[PDB]
Design a protein around this ligand. Structure first.
Ligand SMILES: *[C@@H]1O[C@H](CO)[C@@H](O[C@@H]2O[C@H](CO)[C@@H](O[C@@H]3O[C@H](CO[C@H]4O[C@H](CO)[C@@H](O)[C@H](O)[C@@H]4O)[C@@H](O)[C@H](O)[C@@H]3O)[C@H](O)[C@H]2NC(C)=O)[C@H](O)[C@H]1NC(C)=O
Lengths: 126, 108, 51
């Protein structure tokens, strides 16, 4: 089966601009969609945004319009996030996943079917 | 954020149902609902497929249904291994996915 | 079909009349297309050829 590979520890002050990578191992990176999620301690699963690795097109949640940008790098086959303007309220566990299949005929970006999960990375901002 | 009971109780052998309720524009218009168990101290798990389908190589003890603007996870008899936080997600407004908080299953 | 979730906006130009145009297309990428069964198609072309 496939195994995702995430980044390591990140410790920053407010105003961090943290870069978080996720490099899949096993499937072709330009085949399935990419979703990012956050899980704060005590809260549930909050979805961040999806990326189309074919053309780089993304769409994020409503409360991140400016703080969260997502880019691709298809030479290696990984994906990068950039978390701008973080405060100490954003201490949370981040998840990397593998979304639905990129087709040329129908939208399947929003399907909540998340087959695979990364191990999870913790950011601390303080 | 998919209105959900925070916890559910029940002794072994009891069949419980965990429901999530949302708005009719999000839940009723599209049959896209999922259920993910996260066992304590682990990553989430993938156990329910589409609105009422199952992934490859998963037990048949869980199923579901969508009724009006809410849906529920049909759970068979409980046991010691079912002590986990269940989460529900479904199609959001336009092109996003909405997820709930959790249901902490307490086996009696 | 034209699969893409599309939006609409309008602009008033001078008095009275408004103009309509596409507002946005919320994120995914479209392909206009027409799917026809091949089975039926091959059956048809040969029947025509016979006549
Ligand atoms: C019009 O014709 C289109 C062109 O074929 C149709 O597109 C097909 O639509 C179906 C439904 O969306 C897509 O189904 C997907 O199928 C894949 C299965 O393929 C994968 O697994 C099989 C196993 O046999 C393997 O053979 C394949 O190589 C893949 O590994 C499922 O995985 C999906 O989850 C989904 O069911 C077809 O892919 C799709 N063909 C495409 C995208 O070109 C279209 O539906 C027809 N009608 C319409 C509405 O346009």
């Amino acid at each position: 089966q496939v195994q995702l590979v995430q980044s390591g520890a990140q410790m920053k002050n407010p105003g961090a601009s943290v870069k978080v990578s996720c490099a899949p191992s096993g499937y072709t990176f330009t085949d399935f969609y990419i979703h990012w999620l956050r899980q704060a301690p005590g809260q549930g699963l909050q979805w961040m945004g999806w990326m189309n690795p074919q053309t780089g097109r993304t769409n994020t949640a409503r409360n991140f319009q400016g703080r969260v940008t997502m880019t691709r790098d298809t030479s290696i086959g990984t994906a990068y996030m950039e978390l701008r303007s973080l405060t100490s309220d954003d201490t949370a566990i981040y998840y990397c996943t593998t979304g639905g299949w990129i087709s040329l005929y129908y939208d399947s970006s929003y399907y909540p079917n998340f087959d695979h999960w990364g191990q999870g990375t913790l950011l601390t901002v303080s | 954020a998919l209105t959900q009971p925070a916890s559910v109780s029940g002794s072994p052998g009891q069949s419980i149902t965990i429901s999530c309720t949302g708005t009719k524009y999000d839940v009723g218009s599209h049959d896209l609902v999922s259920w993910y168990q996260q066992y304590p101290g682990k990553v989430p798990k993938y156990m329910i497929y589409e609105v009422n389908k199952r992934p490859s190589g998963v037990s048949n003890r869980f199923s579901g249904s969508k009724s009006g603007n809410t849906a529920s996870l049909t759970i068979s008899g409980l046991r010691a291994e079912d002590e986990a936080d269940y989460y529900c997600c479904s199609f959001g407004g336009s092109a996003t996915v909405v997820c709930g908080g959790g249901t902490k299953v307490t086996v009696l | 079909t034209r699969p893409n979730n599309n939006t609409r906006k309008s602009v008033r130009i001078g008095p009275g009349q408004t103009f309509y145009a596409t507002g946005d297309i919320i994120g995914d990428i479209k392909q206009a297309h027409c799917n026809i069964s091949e089975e039926k198609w091959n059956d048809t072309l040969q029947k025509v050829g016979i006549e």
